[PDB]
Amino acid sequence: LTQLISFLFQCTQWLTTQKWSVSDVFLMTTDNYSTVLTPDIENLITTLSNGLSTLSLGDDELIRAAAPLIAASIQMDSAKTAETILLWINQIKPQGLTFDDFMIIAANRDRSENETSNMVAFCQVLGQLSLIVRNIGLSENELTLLVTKPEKFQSETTALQHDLPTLQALTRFHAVIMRCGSYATEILTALELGALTAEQLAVALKFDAQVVTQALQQTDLGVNTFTNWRTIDVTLQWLDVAA
């Protein structure tokens, strides 16, 4: 009960910090979408049907050929954000559909009601993705790190989820990156590797090197570097409580 009270408090403060309503996160998160076929979905069907060439193969070439057209259909400014979002939705499979077998439901125009229902489900999980990326701001060096390497997000994850705690942690991740300022892509490419150390996060966030490694010593017994995001989050919490 006190865990649920603590969750409701931190989620409500997160909502009022981001200036989002409960209806906003409900639109970004739910499974209770409607299954009716919308002219947006129809435009996606005919754009990605007539735009793609002869039959391409999966995550090697199909996803790269279809990422500009699927960034054309739903509101995106970068095809590579669309490519990593399609990687995300392939490893999550809304109602079983990958992007393969969504192509086959498309370009039919002779499809059953459950088939077009799964189709609309795929398109609206794509819409929830496009919202969940554009509302927090994820400039694809930030996003494909967490989609392709979810171990760098949390050490237990192994597949980035569509949860509300994952959304809140994405918010905190984006906030600390934009707090890093001019060093932000340098911190990100050090977190790509296992090369994110103290004297580097401390300069980026204007802390001291010894205080940062002294809090890293509190979250990790003998780990020299930041190999994860969760260790950075909790070591910044140690820094806040010490400050």
């Binding site: 001291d208 010894q210 205080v211």
Partner: protein
């Protein structure tokens, strides 16, 4: 009392909390922060305090 008492100013290895807490209160400084305050006075080293 300004006694000639040896004290290691690295932030974990003193355990003489009275003198070190007096220096932290007098200089308005942390453990780490007193330690780099002593490193600046010796060119990045800590010989003996």
């Amino acid at each position: 009392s300004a006694d000639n008492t040896k004290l290691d100013l690295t932030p974990g290895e003193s355990k003489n909390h009275f003198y070190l807490g007096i220096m932290k209160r007098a200089f308005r400084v942390n453990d780490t922060e007193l330690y780099t305050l002593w490193k600046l006075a010796n060119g990045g080293t800590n010989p003996e305090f």
